[PDB]
UniProtKB/Swiss-Prot annotation, chain A:
<protein>
    <recommendedName>
        <fullName>Nuclear receptor coactivator 1</fullName>
    </recommendedName>
</protein>
<feature type="short sequence motif" description="LXXLL motif 4">
    <location>
        <begin position="5"/>
        <end position="9"/>
    </location>
</feature>
<comment type="function">
    <text>Nuclear receptor coactivator that directly binds nuclear receptors and stimulates the transcriptional activities in a hormone-dependent fashion. Involved in the coactivation of different nuclear receptors, such as for steroids (PGR, GR and ER), retinoids (RXRs), thyroid hormone (TRs) and prostanoids (PPARs). Also involved in coactivation mediated by STAT3, STAT5A, STAT5B and STAT6 transcription factors. Displays histone acetyltransferase activity toward H3 and H4; the relevance of such activity remains however unclear.</text>
</comment>
<comment type="subunit">
    <text>Interacts with PPARA; the interaction is direct. Interacts with PPARG; the interaction is direct. Interacts with ESRRG; the interaction is direct. Interacts with STAT5A (via FDL motif). Interacts with STAT5B (via FDL motif). Interacts with STAT6 (via LXXLL motif). Interacts (via LXXLL 1, 2 and 3 motifs) with RORC (via AF-2 motif). Interacts with ASXL1. Interacts with the methyltransferase CARM1. Interacts with COPS5. Interacts with the histone acetyltransferase CREBBP. Interacts with DDX5. Interacts with the histone acetyltransferase EP300. Interacts with ESR1. Interacts with GCCR.</text>
</comment>
<comment type="similarity">
    <text>Belongs to the SRC/p160 nuclear receptor coactivator family.</text>
</comment>
From Swiss-Prot, chain B:
<dbReference type="GO" id="GO:0006631">
    <property type="term" value="P:fatty acid metabolic process"/>
</dbReference>
<dbReference type="GO" id="GO:0048511">
    <property type="term" value="P:rhythmic process"/>
</dbReference>
<dbReference type="GO" id="GO:1902895">
    <property type="term" value="P:positive regulation of miRNA transcription"/>
</dbReference>
<dbReference type="GO" id="GO:0000976">
    <property type="term" value="F:transcription cis-regulatory region binding"/>
</dbReference>
<dbReference type="GO" id="GO:0030522">
    <property type="term" value="P:intracellular receptor signaling pathway"/>
</dbReference>
<dbReference type="GO" id="GO:0010745">
    <property type="term" value="P:negative regulation of macrophage derived foam cell differentiation"/>
</dbReference>
<dbReference type="GO" id="GO:0004955">
    <property type="term" value="F:prostaglandin receptor activity"/>
</dbReference>
<dbReference type="GO" id="GO:1901202">
    <property type="term" value="P:negative regulation of extracellular matrix assembly"/>
</dbReference>
<dbReference type="GO" id="GO:0032376">
    <property type="term" value="P:positive regulation of cholesterol transport"/>
</dbReference>
Length: 11, 274
């Protein structure tokens, strides 16, 4: 998983 | 001239406006600071231990994660500070990527993969804008840290920035402006040969269009410089060498300093990188 990158890309 | 090359102008203009919105410190502004031409910024010059301490007011060491790193010896604080600037770079690059036409329509797993392998190549590309042979602008151009000062840190921290300076003096010879770099970094992001890409085809489709735009941009903006396009693509491989070297040095640093920890965003990027 890449939780922070996922979060940066979804917000 | 023609409708095809007209679409490539619009794309170049779209990417330029997006780059301006995404990146506070542009190469235009950075060069103005380094040549002395009047600006907001008075960069405090850091050349030794004493100057760094007197310049702590102007550097935001306060924002480094985790906090225990903020109290450690100079070399670790400078390294962590540089790594922390990278964290803020990732956020700006991520926002820029989302503005590249077709990027947010890619498989989200592929968006993550492109950024994971792209960000440091883009970080060190754009860092060349903030560098001369004497030093590097830091803290959005409110600091100037000398090359010699970064060379002087104890091992294994002593030469962590030298490869970036050596890449920067060559790269800055191409005399690319912000408008050229805006397209070049989009080309780097949309690299179809990153490991573990699920669907390469729509990434190469987008990059092909970005590469054409970059080519047209370098013909129009530097019409007296003839093979600028060709020289620039050679550098995209010199960038990968810098990142592999940096990740290798980071592995050495993590294992020699066992109680150093990294920002979790950098842990997630560096994990299973080269």
């Amino acid at each position: 998983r890449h939780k922070i990158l996922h979060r940066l890309l979804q917000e | 001239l023609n409708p095809e090359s007209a679409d490539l102008r619009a794309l170049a203009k779209h990417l330029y406006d997006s780059y301006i919105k995404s990146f506070p410190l542009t190469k235009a502004k950075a060069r103005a600071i380094l040549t002395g031409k009047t600006t907001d910024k008075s960069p405090f010059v850091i050349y030794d231990m004493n100057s760094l301490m007197m310049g702590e007011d102007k550097i935001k060491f306060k924002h480094i994660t985790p906090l225990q790193e903020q109290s450690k010896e100079v070399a670790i604080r400078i390294f962590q500070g540089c790594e922390f600037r990278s964290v803020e770079a990732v956020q700006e690059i991520t926002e820029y990527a989302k503005s590249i036409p077709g990027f947010v329509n890619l498989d989200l797993n592929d968006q993550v993969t492109l950024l994971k392998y792209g960000v440091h190549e883009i970080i060190y590309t754009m860092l060349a804008s903030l560098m001369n042979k004497d030093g590097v602008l830091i803290s959005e151009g409110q600091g100037f840290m000398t090359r010699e000062f970064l060379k002087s840190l104890r091992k294994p921290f002593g030469d962590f920035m030298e490869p970036k300076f050596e890449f920067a003096v060559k790269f800055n010879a191409l005399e690319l402006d912000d408008s050229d770099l805006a397209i070049f970094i989009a080309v780097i992001i949309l690299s179809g040969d990153r490991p573990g890409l699920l669907n390469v085809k729509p990434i190469e489709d987008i990059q092909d269009n970005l590469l054409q735009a970059l080519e047209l941009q370098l013909k129009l903006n530097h019409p007296e410089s003839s093979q600028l396009f060709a020289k620039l693509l050679q550098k995209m491989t010199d960038l990968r060498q810098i990142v592999t070297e940096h990740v290798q040095l980071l592995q050495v640093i993590k294992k020699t300093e066992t109680d150093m920890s990294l920002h979790p965003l950098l842990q997630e990027i560096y994990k299973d990188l080269y």
